[PDB]
Amino acid sequence: GDMVTRQALRGRETAALLKGIFKGSPSGVLRRLQVYKHCVSLVESGDLHVGKVSEIIGLLMLEARQLPGHALAELATLFVEVIKRGSLSNGKSLELFSTVLTALFKKQLINTLCSSKWDPQCVIHLANMFRDIPLSGEELQ
């Protein structure tokens, strides 16, 4: 994954890396999860252009449907940890988290999110994510 991260400076080969992820998919789950976490970190860096980040997020959302429950839960926990760290400055991570939540312990996940303290200057992005995936009657209150 580190080599792919180094090679994805231009952003042209990242799609080929996704094919490599497919080569991982058909050991595979852990490599895919690590690649997803590193891609989330790279998008959080913000160095990549808007179009490349949008295409990468779309491809990741499309590919996340086939992933198993354990990898999805691990990615959700990592996203919650990143939100607690408050190092997010783009809505692409919010869209990815919304897609992961839509794929679907979900009630416990949103309850734990509710118990947490929000980071100022990211409340609008949290609201964007919440309208992306609606909550229940009691959690929304």
Side-chain angles (χ1 to χ4, degrees), residues 45-46 50-51 53-54 56-59:
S45 83
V50 177
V53 168
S54 304
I56 291 155
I57 291 282
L59 289 163

Side-chain angles (χ1 to χ4, degrees), residues 18 24 35 43 109 120:
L18 190 74
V35 167
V43 169
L109 174 53

Side-chain angles (χ1 to χ4, degrees), residues 105 107 109-112 114-116 118-120:
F105 79 109
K107 61 191 182 293
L109 174 53
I110 56 163
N111 198 352
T112 55
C114 280
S115 67
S116 298
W118 269 247
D119 189 358

Side-chain angles (χ1 to χ4, degrees), residues 18 20 24 26 28 33 35 38-41 43 45-46 50-51 53-54 56-60 62 64 67-69 71-73 76-78 80 82 86-87 89-91 97-100 103 105 107 109-112 114-116 118-120 124-125 127 130-131:
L18 190 74
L33 186 65
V35 167
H38 208 104
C39 276
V40 166
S41 171
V43 169
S45 83
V50 177
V53 168
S54 304
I56 291 155
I57 291 282
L59 289 163
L60 290 157
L62 286 157
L67 297 173
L72 293 160
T77 58
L78 195 144
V80 167
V82 167
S87 305
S89 66
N90 190 43
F97 182 76
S98 60
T99 49
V100 167
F105 79 109
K107 61 191 182 293
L109 174 53
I110 56 163
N111 198 352
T112 55
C114 280
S115 67
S116 298
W118 269 247
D119 189 358
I124 65 191
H125 299 267
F130 266 106
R131 65 181 278 191

